[PDB]
Amino acid sequence: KFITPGVIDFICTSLIAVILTIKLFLLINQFEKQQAAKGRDITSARIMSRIIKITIIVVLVLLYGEHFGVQTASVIAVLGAAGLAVGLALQGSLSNLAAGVLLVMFRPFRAGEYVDLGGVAGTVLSVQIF
Amino acid sequence: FTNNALNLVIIFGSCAALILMSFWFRRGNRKRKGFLFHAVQFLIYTIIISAVGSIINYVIENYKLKFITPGVIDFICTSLIAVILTIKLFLLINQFEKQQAAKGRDITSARIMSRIIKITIIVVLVLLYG
Ligand SMILES: CCCCCCCCCCCC
Ligand SMILES: CCCCCCCCCCCC
Ligand SMILES: CCCCCCCCCCCC
Ligand SMILES: CCCCCCCCCCCC
Ligand SMILES: CCCCCCCCCCCC
């Protein structure tokens, strides 16, 4: 019917990607709710959620490049290098983010609990992203 | 021509996606970055340039080339996509510089950061232009 083979494959790949993204976003929402109503505030949870959403969007764009080389290849070649350079410079940022996520998950101390962290004692106000 | 059904469908889909995104944003502000409508425009422009390249190939294999070597359209579309990407990156740099300036920072540091980012983008352009 004058239909070039490949349209069905494109549709199925797009649908699979959409389902994967929806599941990832549901997981992000569950994680954000757990962080919020466990020990964390709202601003940090929202920031973490939107960071995860941006990361998923970036991974989608990177994987979507298998269709056209003039749509994402002309931009992915720079985005990947910039992200790698930032991660190399920002390694401490990711380390702090992971440590904060662990502190929210495992609760050695809660807000309003007098603690001593390496010679610096005082009441804990809130655990933020970094 | 009716033969380019795939190109017609892709262009119509890109246009419909842009229109729907505009309608959604009018009813409610888009989440994450405001750059969502800029990324949507970038992707639609990439799709349009791919369709234009396909139609040029069809014309060259069907219609007279008018002594035009195939590739000029591809070069033009790639250059236009790069220009749009650079404009969006520069707008993001300007937003970041304004935020740094009128948040806690002075003007000299903000200007230096902005021009450093501009130089980095120019370098990435030169590297990709090779
Ligand atoms: C409201 C806070 C917005 C921050 C969203 C995440 C930004 C990630 C930038 C990554 C640069 C390497
Ligand atoms: C209940 C167990 C949850 C464990 C999931 C951890 C997810 C870490 C998110 C990392 C964000 C960059
Ligand atoms: C009190 C709930 C504890 C949940 C901890 C789950 C273990 C996460 C392992 C992460 C490995 C990177
Ligand atoms: C007025 C300050 C000009 C500095 C502009 C950035 C220079 C970057 C040089 C990078 C060398 C590796
Ligand atoms: C509101 C969130 C803004 C986050 C963007 C960070 C950009 C870092 C610039 C790095 C310059 C080399």
From Swiss-Prot, chain A:
Residues of the full protein shown: 71 to 139 of 343
Protein name in the entry: Low conductance mechanosensitive channel YnaI
Spans within the Cytoplasmic topological domain: 29-55
Localisation per UniProt entry: Cell inner membrane
Family recorded in the similarity comment: Belongs to the MscS (TC 1.A.23) family.
Function: Mechanosensitive channel that protects cells against hypoosmotic stress when highly overexpressed.
Organism: Escherichia coli (strain K12)
Tree of life domain: Bacteria
Subunit details: Homoheptamer.
Membrane spanning residue stretches: 8-28, 56-69
